[PDB]
């Protein structure tokens, strides 16, 4: 079972990557903490210092991985205007069919989100972690976007962030 993300334009099959991390924004303002994919600009993404040569949004593609467990970093955990950089210990493949979709193992992604929620729980001391879609922004930032071979591709990521974790 795979999460089939719609993408435009259709990414060639050789543009498949390994998701090595992502960047989150905590919801501002019920004992729950809500996170969404970061809508921050390129400079904000670069500050995580876990990317590789591939430029992408909401998800680091072909970047660096942590050693043993997921590592979450933030300049200020209590500042919702500061991004949360998440570095995965094990990457998550996103295989693009070339027919307008890129697929991700749903069980792998759920296990990844569960680990991220565990690290967020020990950081915010909470009991419920919720992932929700992007609040909005320009097309490159509201969608999971990336540069492959000099061409920009846009994949809707709403399926990747809509879930609850206790």
């Amino acid at each position, epitope marked *: 079972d795979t999460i089939t993300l719609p993408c435009r334009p259709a990414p060639p099959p050789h543009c498949s990557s390994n998701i090595t991390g992502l960047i989150l*924004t905590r*919801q*501002g*303002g019920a004992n729950t903490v*809500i996170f*969404r994919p*970061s*809508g*921050g*600009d390129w*400079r*904000d993404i670069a500050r995580c210092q876990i990317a590789g040569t591939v430029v992408s949004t909401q998800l680091f593609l072909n970047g660096s991985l942590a050693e043993e467990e997921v590592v979450i970093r933030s*300049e*200020d955990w*209590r*500042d*919702n*205007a500061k991004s949360i950089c998440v570095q995965l210990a094990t990457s998550v493949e996103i295989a693009c069919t070339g027919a307008g979709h890129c697929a991700i193992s749903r069980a792998k992604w759920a296990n990844t989100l569960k680990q991220i929620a565990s690290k967020l729980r020990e950081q915010y001391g909470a009991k419920t972690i919720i992932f929700k879609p*992007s*609040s*909005g*922004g*320009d097309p*490159e*930032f*509201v969608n999971h976007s990336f540069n492959c071979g000099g061409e920009f591709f846009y994949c809707a990521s709403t399926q990747l962030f809509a879930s609850t974790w206790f």
Partner: antibody, heavy 122, light 103 residues
């Protein structure tokens, strides 16, 4: 260095309102734009911010789903739209710009607009 | 959560005003701000950080406090200081303290 807001608005319940905020005298893209409202005789209530480079906002949980913040860098103007208006949405709506900070704590609002009155009533 | 005290303060010009702001569910950071607001006007930044005056703020305004307790002091009240004051930490605002002229 100022923030110039659009004129006062009158709306029926259930309608929507869009308020503009034009910045001048500083680099609009180098600061987040926040929105703070104040009901008559009440305190200040933060509504959200928007990143002017990317357009990516972050709303307060209270207004999530009803508020949409956009911007237009060509005219250095930020917009706030509130839908599903209720009578208790009657307030003065301010745009506020945090100052550059040594600790990079971008919540010190040294620059405010004059506010836009929105009256929601039948 | 920011709660201020007292809700109302009645003092004559020339004497000292002490305003309090307590953060409840915080670990304790100096990221606090004090604002002054007069009727019909937007808030004016007075203190940023625990104790740093904003540009041009007169000497009689000072801030202090560590951890969860914070204080704004007006050493000698001028007639234009009688207004409403708010504290702020991230997106949270206190409910405000109104300072009025005792006569």
């Amino acid at each position: 260095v100022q923030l110039v807001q659009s004129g006062a608005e009158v709306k029926q319940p259930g309608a929507s309102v869009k308020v503009s905020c034009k910045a001048s005298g500083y680099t609009f893209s180098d600061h987040f734009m926040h929105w703070v409202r104040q009901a008559p005789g009440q305190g200040l209530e933060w509504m959200g911010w928007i990143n002017p480079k990317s357009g990516g906002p972050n709303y307060a949980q209270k207004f999530q789903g009803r508020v949409t913040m956009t911007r237009d860098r060509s005219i250095s103007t930020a917009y706030m739209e509130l839908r599903g208006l209720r009578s208790d949405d009657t307030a003065i709506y301010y745009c506020a710009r945090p100052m550059h900070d040594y600790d990079d704590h971008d919540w010190y609002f040294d620059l405010w607009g004059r506010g836009t009155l929105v009256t929601v009533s039948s | 959560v920011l709660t201020q005290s007292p809700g109302t303060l009645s003092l004559s010009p020339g004497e000292r005003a002490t305003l309090s702001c307590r953060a409840s569910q915080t670990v304790g950071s100096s990221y606090l701000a004090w604002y002054q607001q007069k009727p019909g006007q937007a808030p004016r930044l007075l203190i940023y950080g625990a104790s740093s005056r904003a540009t041009g703020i007169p000497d009689r305004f000072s801030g202090s406090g560590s951890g969860t307790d914070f204080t704004l002091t007006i050493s000698r009240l001028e007639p234009e200081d009688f207004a409403v004051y708010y504290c702020q930490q991230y997106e949270a605002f206190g409910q405000g303290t109104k300072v009025e002229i005792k006569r």
